[PDB]
Amino acid sequence: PRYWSLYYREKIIEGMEKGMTAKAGLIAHGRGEAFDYLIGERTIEPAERAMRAAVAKFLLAEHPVISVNGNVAALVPKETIELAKALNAKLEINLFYRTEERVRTIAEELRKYDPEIEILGINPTKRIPGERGKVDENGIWKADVVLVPLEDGDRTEALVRMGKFVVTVDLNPLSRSARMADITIVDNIVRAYPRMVELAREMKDYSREELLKIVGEYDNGKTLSDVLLHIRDRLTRLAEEGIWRRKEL
Amino acid sequence: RYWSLYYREKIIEGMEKGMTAKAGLIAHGRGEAFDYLIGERTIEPAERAMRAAVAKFLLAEHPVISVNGNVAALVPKETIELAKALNAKLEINLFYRTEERVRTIAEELRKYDPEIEILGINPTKRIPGLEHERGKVDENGIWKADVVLVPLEDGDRTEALVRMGKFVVTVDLNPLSRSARMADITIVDNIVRAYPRMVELAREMKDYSREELLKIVGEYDNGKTLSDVLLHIRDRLTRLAEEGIWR
Ligand SMILES: CC(C)(COP(=O)(O)O)[C@@H](O)C(=O)OP(=O)(O)OC[C@H]1O[C@@H](n2cnc3c(N)ncnc32)[C@H](O)[C@@H]1O
Ligand SMILES: CC(C)(COP(=O)(O)O)[C@@H](O)C(=O)OP(=O)(O)OC[C@H]1O[C@@H](n2cnc3c(N)ncnc32)[C@H](O)[C@@H]1O
């Protein structure tokens, strides 16, 4: 139960000691944990719904890109790579609190899982019209669909104003990033990525019309509302049944 | 928001000194989120919990206030004031215990009170069910305590103390945590606000007879209080869905 929360908590700490994860990242991880408590630390129906749309969107994309930050590098290095391949997307390292050493360390971390994998962002020349804020001209710069997980709200908003269709993974359904993205997956990235990889496989042979069917029916606003409603119902349920001295929830 | 950054730095600095555990930085972030969820203030259920905690401490025969790396960075002065106001002993008790951390914590406290007695330097007693360094307490502190305050604590340790028959009070912004659920009295408020309020409550209740104190404790239901905290959060989530930008 709490085993994994402790497991990933140590992974996050390891990432900082290795030079990949920022201190702000440890703070961020903690905030995510609070919200993971609200949704019961699992994938809820509204999240699976959002992931179906996300995968469909990527499979329909012309220049898809998956972004990687210090937290992603520490939590799902292999899965982020598998997702990129499953979605035929490019991987770009893009840090909010960027330093070249963090970028190099992250790239090295990813290489350990796939020495031949192509990694963008090591030398970003273009800049998102929003000091920092540089992106690879062959990656996010040209991308039509971008996946930017555990992202700072402002950054998420910038990319959108930039004409990009933004997909994010964020446990905080009330965050600016969650509200601003086009498709918001409110689930722990450690759970969301392996589910998306599997969804991608299952949808591999879908025609364009059935992929468009899934995307067209998706409403991000309605989905975020369902997330909050799920949380409110669960809270009401817990309050009414009581949680004092309760072993597990 | 200004004070949010202020306390974040205190924690980060505490981490760089080797006083606050690294996990404490993560725990601080979890606290920030829940503080946001309840309103960044002392809600009525928290005040209700504090009144009962204070009354219970004034009834205690061997009260002890536990101190960890996060307390040391956030409320070093207020925890000493609280121990005095409640006539309780102070004991450093860490989950990620190391002698260097204990010494560093003790030193921080000494900056505010050079003569303050500090237990937990040489713990010789084991908490049943708790292994190694994470499970030893001071023979004259928590080991003999009837009422103990273990703020921002890991649930397993809170529970182990309860299993021992001790009356456990905790300050924890996460009402859903195992610690919050297992404690006898759970204060869901930020510790930077809770301690100064408990200091004030203690002075206001110092002349209370044991009957008045027992009245307060007797009317306190931690289960209903935890439920109210959850309903409060639920209601805030709702309003919050209107307050602030959207899309
Ligand atoms: C995370 C961080 C520090 C990484 O910086 P860098 O590595 O420099 O790019 C940076 O992107 C940042 O400042 O993010 P924020 O803290 O603004 O927002 C991160 C969002 O991710 C959420 N979150 C944290 N961990 C997870 C998680 N494990 N899974 C899903 N969501 C998560 C967190 O609640 C918050 O809503
Ligand atoms: C905090 C920590 C790492 C300290 O370790 P050590 O110093 O080694 O004893 C250890 O006790 C721990 O792991 O605690 P947990 O993370 O299990 O639980 C701490 C609780 O405190 C909560 N919290 C964080 N900051 C505050 C705070 N500022 N005020 C009230 N509650 C807070 C946090 O949300 C969490 O529910």
Please tell me what DSSP assigns to residue A141: T
Q: How many CB pairs under 8 A join A and B?
A: 111
Q: Which ligand is in closest contact with the Cα of B46?
A: 2
Strand, coil or helix: what is A39?
coil
Mutation to probe ligand 2, out of B152, B173, B177 (largest number of atoms < 8 A from CB): B152
A130 and A148 in contact (C-beta within 8 Å)?
no
Instruction: Write a three-state SS string for chain B.
Output: CHHHHHHHHHHHHHHHHCCCCHHHHHHHHHHHHHHHHHCCCCCHHHHHHHHHHHHHHHHCCCEEEEECHHHHHHCHHHHHHHHHHCCCEEEECCCCCCHHHHHHHHHHHHCCCCCCCEECCCCCEECCCCCHHHHEECCCCCCCCCEEECCCCCHHHHHHHHHCCCEEEEECCCCCCHHHHHCCEEECCCHHHHHHHHHHHHHHHCCCCHHHHHHHHHHCCHHHHHHHHHHHHHHHHHHHCCCCCCC
Is A37 near chain B, with CB under 8 Å?
A: yes
Strand, coil or helix: what is A91?
strand
Residue A41 sits in a domain whose CATH number is 3.40.50.12640
Chain A residues close to B15, C-beta within 8 Å: 23
What gap in Å lies between CA A125 and CA A94, rounded to an integer?
12
Short-list B184, B197, B209, CA closest to B46? B197
Using a 10 angstrom Cβ sphere, with 0-12 exposed, 13-18 middle and 19 or more buried, the burial of residue A192 is buried
What gap in Å lies between CA B84 and CA B81, rounded to an integer?
5
A83 and A200 in contact (C-beta within 8 Å)?
yes
What gap in Å lies between CA B204 and CA B63, rounded to an integer?
18
Place of tokens 């992106």: A135
Amino acid at B112: Y
Give whole-number Cα distances, B175 to A242, B155, B182, B189, in Å: 12, 12, 10, 10
B124 and B175 in contact (C-beta within 8 Å)?
no
- A235–B234 CB contact, under 8 Å: yes
Closest-CA distance of chain B to residue A175, Å: 9
DSSP-H helix ranges across A113-152: none
What gap in Å lies between CA B50 and CA A171, rounded to an integer?
31
Is B4 near chain A, with CB under 8 Å?
A: no
Strand, coil or helix: what is A139?
coil
A167 and A50 in contact (C-beta within 8 Å)?
no
What gap in Å lies between CA B216 and CA B55, rounded to an integer?
7
Closest-CA distance of chain A to residue B69, Å: 16
What gap in Å lies between CA A170 and CA A161, rounded to an integer?
19
C-alpha angle A188-A193-A194 in degrees, rounded to nearest 5:
110
Alpha carbons within 13 angstroms on the beta-carbon side of residue B245 total: 11
A167 and A148 in contact (C-beta within 8 Å)?
yes
Place of tokens 């589910």: A195
User: Taking the mean position of all CA atoms in its chain, how far away is CA A44?
Assistant: 15
Buried b (16+ CB within 10 A) or exposed e, B140-159: bbbbebebbbbbbbbbbbbb
Alpha carbons within 13 angstroms on the beta-carbon side of residue B85 total: 20
Nearest ligand 1 atom, CA A171 = 31
**Closest chain B residue to A39, measured at CA:** B176
Radius of gyration of chain A (CA): 18
A146 and A167 in contact (C-beta within 8 Å)?
yes
Chain A residues close to B152, C-beta within 8 Å: none
Task: Determine if ligand 2 sits within 6 Å of the CB of residue B120.
Answer: no
Short-list A153, A12, A37, A174, CA closest to B173? A37
Contacts of A232 (CB under 8 A, 6+ apart): B234, B237, B238
Atom 26 (ligand 1): residue with closest C-alpha?
Answer: A32
Task: Determine if ligand 2 sits within 6 Å of the CB of residue B15.
Answer: no
Strand, coil or helix: what is A165?
strand
What gap in Å lies between CA A63 and CA B47, rounded to an integer?
55
Atom 4 (ligand 2): residue with closest C-alpha?
Answer: B24
Of A26, A38, A232, the CB nearest to B26: A26
* Number of domains, chain B: 1
A196 token code pair: 């998306």
Amino acid at A193: Y
Contacts of B136 (CB under 8 A, 6+ apart): B97, B123, B124, B125, B126, B127, B130
Place of tokens 């340790």: B157
What gap in Å lies between CA B176 and CA B174, rounded to an integer?
5
B74 and B196 in contact (C-beta within 8 Å)?
no
Of A13, A34, A239, the CB nearest to B23: A13
The domain containing residue B82 runs over which residues? 1-247
B6 token code pair: 């202020």
